[PDB]
Write an enzyme that holds these catalytic residues in place. Structure first.
Site, PDB file in Angstrom:
ATOM      1  N   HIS A 365     113.498  65.253   3.052  1.00  0.00           N
ATOM      2  CA  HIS A 365     113.834  66.278   4.128  1.00  0.00           C
ATOM      3  C   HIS A 365     113.231  66.186   5.498  1.00  0.00           C
ATOM      4  O   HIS A 365     113.698  66.861   6.145  1.00  0.00           O
ATOM      5  CB  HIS A 365     113.445  67.580   3.563  1.00  0.00           C
ATOM      6  CG  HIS A 365     114.246  67.735   2.335  1.00  0.00           C
ATOM      7  ND1 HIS A 365     115.669  68.635   2.252  1.00  0.00           N
ATOM      8  CD2 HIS A 365     113.872  68.145   0.939  1.00  0.00           C
ATOM      9  CE1 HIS A 365     115.817  69.138   1.045  1.00  0.00           C
ATOM     10  NE2 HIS A 365     115.037  68.494   0.244  1.00  0.00           N
ATOM     11  N   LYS A 556     114.442  79.536  14.794  1.00  0.00           N
ATOM     12  CA  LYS A 556     113.837  78.859  13.621  1.00  0.00           C
ATOM     13  C   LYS A 556     112.498  78.831  13.567  1.00  0.00           C
ATOM     14  O   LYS A 556     111.875  79.256  14.746  1.00  0.00           O
ATOM     15  CB  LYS A 556     114.454  77.332  13.829  1.00  0.00           C
ATOM     16  CG  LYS A 556     114.147  76.657  15.225  1.00  0.00           C
ATOM     17  CD  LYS A 556     115.378  76.512  16.215  1.00  0.00           C
ATOM     18  CE  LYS A 556     115.901  75.235  15.870  1.00  0.00           C
ATOM     19  NZ  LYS A 556     117.276  75.321  15.159  1.00  0.00           N
ATOM     20  N   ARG A 557     111.937  77.980  12.860  1.00  0.00           N
ATOM     21  CA  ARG A 557     110.520  77.910  13.002  1.00  0.00           C
ATOM     22  C   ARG A 557     109.996  77.418  14.074  1.00  0.00           C
ATOM     23  O   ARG A 557     110.751  76.552  14.804  1.00  0.00           O
ATOM     24  CB  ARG A 557     109.803  77.131  11.511  1.00  0.00           C
ATOM     25  CG  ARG A 557     110.062  77.917  10.201  1.00  0.00           C
ATOM     26  CD  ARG A 557     109.126  79.096  10.229  1.00  0.00           C
ATOM     27  NE  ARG A 557     107.671  78.647  10.342  1.00  0.00           N
ATOM     28  CZ  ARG A 557     107.011  78.694   9.442  1.00  0.00           C
ATOM     29  NH1 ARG A 557     107.253  78.774   8.315  1.00  0.00           N
ATOM     30  NH2 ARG A 557     105.651  78.170   9.306  1.00  0.00           N
ATOM     31  N   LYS A 562     111.201  71.110  17.454  1.00  0.00           N
ATOM     32  CA  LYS A 562     112.266  71.882  17.625  1.00  0.00           C
ATOM     33  C   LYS A 562     112.428  71.915  19.282  1.00  0.00           C
ATOM     34  O   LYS A 562     113.550  72.530  19.739  1.00  0.00           O
ATOM     35  CB  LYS A 562     112.125  73.037  16.909  1.00  0.00           C
ATOM     36  CG  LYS A 562     111.673  72.832  15.423  1.00  0.00           C
ATOM     37  CD  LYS A 562     112.852  73.054  14.602  1.00  0.00           C
ATOM     38  CE  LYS A 562     112.448  73.789  13.052  1.00  0.00           C
ATOM     39  NZ  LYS A 562     113.411  73.277  12.043  1.00  0.00           N
ATOM     40  N   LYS A 668     125.345  77.805  10.351  1.00  0.00           N
ATOM     41  CA  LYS A 668     125.488  79.230  10.401  1.00  0.00           C
ATOM     42  C   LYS A 668     125.912  79.665  11.694  1.00  0.00           C
ATOM     43  O   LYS A 668     126.931  80.702  11.468  1.00  0.00           O
ATOM     44  CB  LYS A 668     124.112  79.870  10.056  1.00  0.00           C
ATOM     45  CG  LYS A 668     123.515  79.545   8.536  1.00  0.00           C
ATOM     46  CD  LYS A 668     121.966  80.064   8.584  1.00  0.00           C
ATOM     47  CE  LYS A 668     121.358  79.204   7.578  1.00  0.00           C
ATOM     48  NZ  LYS A 668     119.762  79.898   7.792  1.00  0.00           N
TER      49      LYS A 668
HETATM   50  O1  LIG Z   1     110.259  70.226   5.451  1.00  0.00           O
HETATM   51  C1  LIG Z   1     111.299  70.550   5.702  1.00  0.00           C
HETATM   52  N1  LIG Z   1     111.519  71.681   6.262  1.00  0.00           N
HETATM   53  C2  LIG Z   1     112.899  71.980   6.656  1.00  0.00           C
HETATM   54  O2  LIG Z   1     113.445  72.745   7.060  1.00  0.00           O
HETATM   55  C3  LIG Z   1     113.636  70.683   6.354  1.00  0.00           C
HETATM   56  N2  LIG Z   1     112.744  69.807   5.995  1.00  0.00           N
HETATM   57  O3  LIG Z   1     114.610  70.830   5.289  1.00  0.00           O
HETATM   58  C4  LIG Z   1     115.858  71.291   5.596  1.00  0.00           C
HETATM   59  C5  LIG Z   1     116.754  71.135   4.301  1.00  0.00           C
HETATM   60  O4  LIG Z   1     116.908  70.025   4.247  1.00  0.00           O
HETATM   61  C6  LIG Z   1     116.323  70.312   6.873  1.00  0.00           C
HETATM   62  O5  LIG Z   1     117.832  71.158   7.189  1.00  0.00           O
HETATM   63  C7  LIG Z   1     115.580  70.540   8.017  1.00  0.00           C
HETATM   64  O6  LIG Z   1     116.214  69.733   9.144  1.00  0.00           O
HETATM   65  C8  LIG Z   1     114.167  69.784   7.597  1.00  0.00           C
HETATM   66  O7  LIG Z   1     113.450  70.168   8.721  1.00  0.00           O
HETATM   67  C1  LIG Z   2     118.864  78.837   8.078  1.00  0.00           C
HETATM   68  C2  LIG Z   2     117.428  79.214   8.201  1.00  0.00           C
HETATM   69  C3  LIG Z   2     116.354  78.481   8.707  1.00  0.00           C
HETATM   70  C4  LIG Z   2     116.790  77.003   9.078  1.00  0.00           C
HETATM   71  O1  LIG Z   2     117.068  76.877  10.388  1.00  0.00           O
HETATM   72  P1  LIG Z   2     117.011  75.660  11.281  1.00  0.00           P
HETATM   73  O2  LIG Z   2     117.589  76.113  12.647  1.00  0.00           O
HETATM   74  O3  LIG Z   2     117.633  74.539  10.389  1.00  0.00           O
HETATM   75  O4  LIG Z   2     115.466  74.885  11.365  1.00  0.00           O
HETATM   76  C5  LIG Z   2     115.039  78.802   8.933  1.00  0.00           C
HETATM   77  N1  LIG Z   2     114.915  80.246   8.841  1.00  0.00           N
HETATM   78  C6  LIG Z   2     115.865  81.254   8.233  1.00  0.00           C
HETATM   79  C7  LIG Z   2     115.433  82.616   8.246  1.00  0.00           C
HETATM   80  C8  LIG Z   2     117.085  80.660   8.006  1.00  0.00           C
HETATM   81  O5  LIG Z   2     117.933  81.565   7.563  1.00  0.00           O
END
Ligand SMILES: O=C1NC(=O)[C@@]2(N1)O[C@H](CO)[C@@H](O)[C@H](O)[C@H]2O
Ligand SMILES: *Cc1c(COP(=O)(O)O)cnc(C)c1O
Ligand SMILES: O=C1NC(=O)[C@@]2(N1)O[C@H](CO)[C@@H](O)[C@H](O)[C@H]2O
Ligand SMILES: *Cc1c(COP(=O)(O)O)cnc(C)c1O
Lengths: 830, 830
Positions: A365, A556-557, A562, A668
């Protein structure tokens, strides 16, 4: 009301009396002292009743038919609330809505009382949750296995613009969805030593911790299938954790039980970052050891625990079992499976290895180095001595394979080793997974290619057949029907309901791209969504926004990769341009940035302070008016995501090309009517490819450009020198324009940006604001904006987790998905 | 079947379907995988359903009528199993028996699966449980308040003849009887400091621990009253226990929550012994602080929280509230009630004091010095600074009262002080309770007199009106109808069922003392009971006993004052006489000694080893045959007591006169057809007084004789010198006759017995074995033994807790008991 199902006469009545039964008998309350929270539980218990019948027959079913079982091992399962989702998958939403209405209650108000199952950090955790929903919907005999942390991801609080972390006691009021199964408790060993005696090695003098399972139901979409998510809790044995005698204190002995039980107390809040703490490693072995025993016991029964060839022949193990490793976290499953097979079952190494490789599959990942799990040998040596021995033996045999394949390539040998020499010896968990799995996959096309070209190049040359790709996806149920019923309804009005479990059918929406009514409707729901969120904002967090502006959101985090910082630079730019020509018209925007920073990530927490700092200035400048608002979305989590995403106009997916493995938030937003401004990173490429680059706002460096720059050498000063607008911002940060009382507050950010920017923020600045101007231009043309939106929505079908799972099923697990309704839930009591 | 109620047609059917509902919906199991444990829970849940309806109306009732509330504060509540007891009080036993029979299950087998609620050590804890049952049965608006320990009294294991302690994880599989009430959580403070500002003192900078309540229903006997037992659990706040920032670790912060939650983790296993540990003091303030807030909140509502004089006048507080202190454990309620009234409500000292004294009552349970609570000032000073200040002020004013009453009596002043000077200053909790309570009572007539004559003499001279007596009692429901249905049935056949809630009616049994059928029956049930126990013994513990022998049993906690050692000396004597004249006839006996030793009580654990050591020799001597068996009853607890007592022939209550406050086991044996050999101690006096000394086996020193001996000086050598049989035993112990491999193993016992016997064991030896000969003689005459038994049973009525409670009610609480059936349980949903 919508297609949230039928509000049948007999069932609304049935629902109501059962709501009352639970309020009385289960909650032991009477209407005169019941609070919204009590009402929420009565309903939860009423809804939960409807799927136990199905839960029991599903499990019994798999026992009779005995199909190949899929075991999804993950240390994270970001579930969120489960009341509504359950109603939706059981077609109970309208009936419950009606019934609670007749009882004089607002269902939506009660749904807001349910605590989020925050047993995840972000993407990785949420993927697992969406996968579970899809696996159920596709009728797979799948089991989600993990840890039942009593404290999930911390709840974020913003104090003085800084993030404050506070424990997420999600179990405080109980969890009506889980079912403790103390009767299936299992023992897990730690420490000890290895004795080599006559016929085999023995793991001896170990400390025992017990694993108590808790099962949570996972209902498929309207097919009567209810799979199981099993979460392990740590418990201390009552013997040795008291019985190892000779002074210490009886009281102290009992108080010290909370030492073995600390294993499942809290989730590590790290996203894409590795922390080599002993407690983490223990959590990893804990979930693996417990799960495997459960897996083998089930196998021992099957139809072999009756007859078959008769002789516990594990040759059919791979034909009955498939274990998916969600990242390297459950990697110890490989050496643990070997240990059991060899040490306990007494299979010869080679036969055991063949079985292990054939049942294990690994999913990668991330490619960033700091996220890679490399465990110090001295740690494995002390905590899991036999496993270390097995890993060394695995390594020995693997390297021999390499030497034989690439004679004389001595550097390749050290490069491929599972054991890394240096300061301290470490074990490369990723190398272990590749060697012991028959399939290794990436989570997006470019990410997968990168693995083959870069990170795991040598492994790809060795066994090219192992490497695959399985682009991520999201569940249309929670991420469309649940969070956006308005959009789901108008889509259904035109093309039906079959798209919910067949998202590809959204393509049929292409033919309404010029439909006047549809354009008006698509535009209407988005407006209704924006108004509802704008309201929630003042309700729960308080201080106004304008629903007519463009909703620019990045949630996102918080990470340097990012690039929330790049978003920040743009926001400041907009501000500066407005202050330069106040009376010039610009498209109004509300830019919302939300996300959580890992507690120890200093930079990330500094960025959150920057965002709030910009809002302090921007939001109180009279000249700006309502043209620009900067808002930091607090405690971003799944339940919050279900609120913002459906109200977004612009989705920000601006990571440095080559760093975001796939991303899922991006998907999403695409399915919910938002337009995407982003880089050719992760799944963004496949999204633009699916909708057409004309309907996407792509900008910045491609992966190639990034590498060219690295050869050359990245110098941020250059960009600072040639772009006055960029220069102006940096000098504003440096001088305290955004931090009056503490003028040097942001020195770390500036310093980093100018001298150690690993994600070249400045390099994509010019092309980023240029591209942002293009989206503003298009927003000024409501009819064309909405038409491009329809092009995205109608073309997002590929991104459903049903597609992803169907591919894992066929290309990795060797099982066939099925959309066959299980034979009703109907009573039955044998 | 017996008078366990009616097995109605409609109700057995109703029971069965609800058993099935829970097995499916609550347990989520299907008949094909259900285990006895699952069946037990289905039933438990089915039975629990029947009293929620009544539980809700009872509580609502008290809210409407608003009567004076009784609050029983105790750190111990020895409840035992609650399934059967609930069936009995609701008249459900036969219906459930039938229904489960029809479902093809054995109810008795399922009852054995229920874990004991061991939240007590012995007598004190069990008294509280019996009191609760009686208070419900007498329709009092009473609440039992305590701590919900997650680990009760340890489970005793005998390894190599030694006691082994192991954690009692009674919650492991859950508790179907309790109802968590997170919504009523309350905060409790610790540490901090006191600020004296303008208008009052302020307790500041305190550490907060939260108290979460759990309510357990307490059903009265067949009157539809279901009272509440509220048990507090400790929980850490999610703020400061994470939010007190500036490095330490986020993970560590979360793991450290188990520091505030340790407060309710385990019960201190001390019986009649004081341990000044900080954790204990915290548990004491914890239950007091939380309970009082609950009490005042309820008072603030009453009918004052509507109108009345209007002005929170606490003058009526005593008229609405009554708090009973079970020993000095909840003593801090006094200074805490003052603190709230004075510091928070702002009442003047004197008005607050008047209120406090008028609502508080104290019960003393022991006179031995090592059992007295004397807390070091430095501990109270650090943990509860404001309370210390209040105690000093209470002391100051109290002593002034004394000086005024006894001018010039300077020694009396220091003697009566709540503060004890010396090595370290301490606070005499007992003195505090007397000063702040309007009533102080003993638990038996002689015990109460002793308090007045000795221990609290000066306090009695000061306020003679405060001192009273309330002889203990036991509940006829659990201790007769529940554990001995056979005896209860034959009694009912002659005199009816009204005696269950009116035990005095047992006197009518006197007129059947010459009835031939009755004598035969009384004798029959005891034989049936002995056979059942003899069976259980081989079932669960394994190695035969003879049901025809006399069942000589002594079961209670192991103490030097209980003199299990004296019982030992007799057993060895019997052995030695048999070895002297093998072919001489003696009445066969099975002497069973059971009890638990506090983990740190070395002597007590040495005594347990002695008992098993005697059994090793005696039980394997061929010459002895089946004439004498020595058995140590393992893990003696409430559920075990319900099995032995009904099977006993001889009850041993041989404590040194003046040391056993009352005792209650003695009463349990008397009501179940056992004859009592004992000393004129505690309640033994009132028992012999009730049945007639001719029908009792009294022996040994009276209190007077003990004191005479102390004046003189106790010299054990004298007895050793004049009694050859005694000499022979001591030299057998000294030489290793009972411990071959370790000849000096029992040197501590011998040494103690000869030089530091605080309970003069030798002094009562001669009169003890002489008296034992008399019971053997009478046992040889079955008809006369049984007739004397009938004299005891028929005369035990006075010892029911209904009598005791009725006296507390009238003479201390100022409330009138009532045997009025509450208006049915009938549905209702307002
Ligand atoms: O360690 C990680 N945290 C993530 O959210 C992550 N790897 O996995 C997700 C699911 O495969 C990916 O969408 C994301 O891009 C990647 O950063
Ligand atoms: C879908 C989701 C994520 C993943 O977001 P990315 O934009 O792929 O980093 C993280 N947090 C929450 C609460 C989500 O619903
Ligand atoms: O501390 C004590 N433990 C007890 O069992 C005790 N005091 O209280 C019981 C109930 O009043 C008494 O029967 C018992 O005699 C006394 O020792
Ligand atoms: C009744 C009871 C006690 C009290 O026994 P005494 O003989 O008064 O010391 C102690 N333990 C249990 C389990 C009881 O039932």
């Amino acid at each position: 009301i919508s297609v949230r199902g039928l509000a049948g006469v007999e069932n609304v009545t049935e629902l109501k009396k059962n709501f009352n039964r639970h309020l009385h008998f289960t909650l032991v309350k009477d209407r005169n002292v019941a609070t919204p929270r009590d009402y929420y539980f009565a309903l939860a218990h009423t809804v939960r009743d409807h799927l136990v019948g199905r839960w029991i027959r599903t499990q019994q079913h798999y026992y009779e038919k005995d199909p190949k079982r899929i075991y999804y091992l993950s240390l994270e399962f970001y579930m969120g609330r489960t009341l509504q989702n359950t109603m939706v998958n059981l077609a109970l939403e309208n009936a419950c809505d009606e019934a609670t209405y007749q009882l004089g209650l607002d269902m939506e108000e009660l749904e807001e009382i349910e605590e989020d199952a925050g047993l995840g950090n972000g993407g990785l955790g949420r993927l697992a949750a969406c996968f579970l929903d899809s696996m159920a919907t596709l009728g797979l005999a799948a089991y989600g296995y993990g840890i039942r942390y009593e404290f999930g991801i911390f709840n974020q609080k913003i104090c003085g613009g800084w993030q404050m972390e506070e424990a997420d006691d999600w179990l405080r009021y109980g969890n009506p969805w889980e079912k403790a199964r103390p009767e299936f408790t299992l023992p897990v060993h730690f420490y000890g030593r290895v004795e080599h005696t006559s016929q085999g090695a023995k793991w001896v003098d170990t400390q025992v911790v017990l694993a108590m399972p808790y099962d949570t139901p996972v209902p498929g979409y309207r097919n009567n299938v209810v799979n199981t998510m099993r979460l392990w809790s740590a418990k201390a044995p009552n013997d040795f954790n008291l019985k190892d005698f000779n002074v210490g204190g009886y009281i102290q002995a009992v108080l010290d039980r909370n030492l073995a039980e600390n294993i499942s107390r809290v989730l590590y809040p790290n996203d894409n970052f590795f922390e080599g703490k002993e407690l983490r490693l223990k959590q990893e072995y804990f979930v693996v050891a417990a799960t495997l025993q459960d897996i083998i016991r089930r196998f021992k029964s099957s139809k072999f625990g009756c007859r078959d060839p008769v002789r516990t022949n594990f040759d059919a193990f791979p034909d009955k079992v498939a274990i998916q490793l969600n990242d390297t976290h459950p990697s110890l499953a490989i050496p643990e499976l070997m240990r059991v097979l060899v040490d306990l079952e007494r299979l010869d190494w080679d036969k055991a290895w063949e079985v292990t490789v054939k049942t294990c599959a690994y999913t990668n990942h991330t490619v960033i180095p700091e996220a890679l799990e490399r465990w110090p040998v001295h740690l494995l040596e002390t905590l899991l001595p036999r496993h270390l021995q097995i890993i060394y033996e695995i390594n020995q045999r693997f390297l021999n394979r390499v030497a034989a394949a690439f004679p004389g390539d001595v550097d390749r040998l050290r490069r491929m080793s599972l054991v890394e020499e240096g300061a301290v010896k470490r074990i490369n968990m990723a190398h272990l997974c590749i060697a012991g799995s028959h399939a290794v996959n990436g989570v997006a096309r470019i990410h997968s290619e990168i693995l083959k070209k870069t990170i795991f190049k040598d492994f790809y040359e060795l066994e090219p057949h192992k490497f695959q790709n399985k682009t991520n996806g999201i569940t249309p149920r929670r991420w469309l029907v649940l969070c956006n019923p308005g959009l789901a309804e108008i889509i259904a009005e035109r093309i039906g309901e079959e798209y919910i479990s067949d998202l590809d059918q959204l393509r049929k929406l292409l033919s309404y791209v010029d439909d006047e009514a549809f354009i008006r409707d698509v535009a209407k729901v988005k407006q209704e969504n924006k108004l509802k969120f704008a309201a929630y904002l003042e309700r729960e967090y308080k201080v106004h926004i304008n629903p007519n502006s463009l909703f620019d959101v990045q949630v996102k985090r918080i990470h340097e990769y990012k690039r929330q910082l790049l978003n920040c630079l743009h926001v400041i730019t907009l501000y500066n341009r407005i202050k330069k020509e106040p009376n010039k018209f610009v498209v109004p925007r509300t830019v919302m940035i939300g996300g959580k920073a890992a507690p120890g990530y200093h930079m990330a927490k500094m960025i959150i302070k920057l965002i709030t700092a910009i809002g302090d200035v921007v939001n109180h400048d009279p000249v700006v008016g309502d043209r620009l608002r900067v808002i930091f979305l607090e405690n971003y989590r799944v339940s919050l995501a279900e609120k913002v995403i459906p109200a977004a106009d612009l989705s920000e997916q601006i990571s440095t090309a080559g760093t975001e493995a796939s991303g899922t938030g991006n998907m999403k937003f695409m399915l919910n009517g938002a337009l995407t401004i982003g880089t050719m990173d992760g799944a963004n490429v496949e999204m633009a490819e699916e909708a057409g680059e004309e309907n996407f706002f792509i900008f910045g460096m491609r992966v190639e450009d990034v590498d060219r720059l690295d050869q050359r050498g990245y110098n941020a000063q250059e960009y600072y020198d040639r772009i006055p607008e960029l220069r102006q911002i940096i000098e504003q940060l440096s001088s305290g324009f955004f931090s009056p009382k503490q003028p040097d507050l942001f020195k770390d950010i500036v310093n980093m940006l100018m001298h150690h920017d690993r994600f070249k923020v400045f390099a994509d600045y010019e092309e980023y604001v240029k591209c942002q101007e293009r989206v503003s231009a298009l927003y000024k043309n409501p009819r064309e904006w909405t038409r491009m939106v329809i092009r995205n929505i109608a073309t997002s079908g590929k991104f459903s987790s049903d597609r992803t799972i169907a591919q894992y099923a066929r290309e990795i697990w060797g099982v066939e998905p099925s959309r066959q309704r299980l034979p009703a839930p109907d009573e039955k009591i044998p």
